[PDB]
Amino acid sequence: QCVNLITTTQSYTNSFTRGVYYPDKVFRSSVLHLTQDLFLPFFSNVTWFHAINPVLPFNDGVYFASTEKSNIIRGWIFGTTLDSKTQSLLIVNNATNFVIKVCEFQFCNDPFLESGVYSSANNCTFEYVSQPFKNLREFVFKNIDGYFKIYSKHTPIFPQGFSALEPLVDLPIGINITRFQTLLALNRSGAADYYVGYLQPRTFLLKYNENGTITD
């Protein structure tokens, strides 16, 4: 059901130092730690989508950022294929909690948000619900060693600041994820802007303060 259209703006983020997250659960006080992990390169070409939907590859990590469109960008789909022949993920949010379930959903052509995304319910394997908590919403998805990691951090007011993304869930689903798709949550009968960046194997020098927070 085609109900929306997007535009691809590939050239953006001339000044970008946002792709930073906590690589592990280790506390460090006034320590300059050298980390080799899947980070987002600084000043990289992040694709900007201006929707008024398409499938995007995962390729070992993806960065997601959303504008102050509250309750608009509140869905994410993951899986190697959008059909019932293989397992697929499904994540939804209601600005207070996160509901995650992985099943062999039969996705439609353009899910818009529930029967609006899938048409069947095959033999699922896992389901989870997260704990409760202009603004900026950043997200990072990883599928290393079967554990699906998600990092997030909310901050008011995009390139004029620095903030590290804290881990939220560590879903041990173990499914193969190659492609992903976002849900715009169209109103039943827009200005939804979201950024998509891909992680790469790079070395970073993390700066920890006295309280154990990544400062730079």
Partner: protein, 145 residues
């Protein structure tokens, strides 16, 4: 002879390999305070598996229409199953019931069904019978109890 663990003089004679030690200070060994106790700490066990609801169910399904329940993402506490009648008959294959409370598993499946007394011995890998061939059969490489 010199017992090297008797006194510090014997220890410095051991280190110097000489019965006569010269005036001075000699490093013989290193001291260390041994651990007094052994502490093992784990988070509170709260995600209990649904086996309690499976065993405490009112009526089970038939032997030919048994319903399988999926057990995952929970702590398999096998000690709580003793609250029912003590008529449990344990017959495991490939795993020990005592060491089962210390191992990990990916997915656990529980099959429940009601049969008579004579068919209890038929629920085992390699058996032959009416129920074992037309109602419920276990594989040769079955792992569980």
């Amino acid at each position: 002879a010199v017992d090297c663990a008797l006194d510090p003089l014997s220890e410095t004679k051991c280190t110097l390999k000489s019965f006569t030690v010269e005036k001075g200070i000699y490093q013989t060994s290193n001291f260390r305070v041994q651990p007094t106790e052994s502490i093992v700490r784990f988070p509170n066990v709260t995600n209990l598996c649904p086996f309690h609801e499976v065993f405490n169910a009112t009526t089970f399904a038939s032997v030919y229409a048994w319903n399988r329940t999926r057990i995952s993402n929970c702590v398999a506490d096998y000690s709580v199953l003793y609250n029912f009648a003590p008529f449990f008959a344990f017959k495991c294959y490939g795993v020990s019931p005592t060491k089962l409370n210390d191992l990990c598993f990916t997915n656990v499946y529980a099959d429940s069904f009601v049969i008579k007394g004579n068919e209890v011995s038929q629920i085992a890998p390699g058996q032959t019978g009416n129920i074992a061939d037309y109602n419920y059969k276990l594989p040769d490489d079955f792992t569980g109890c």
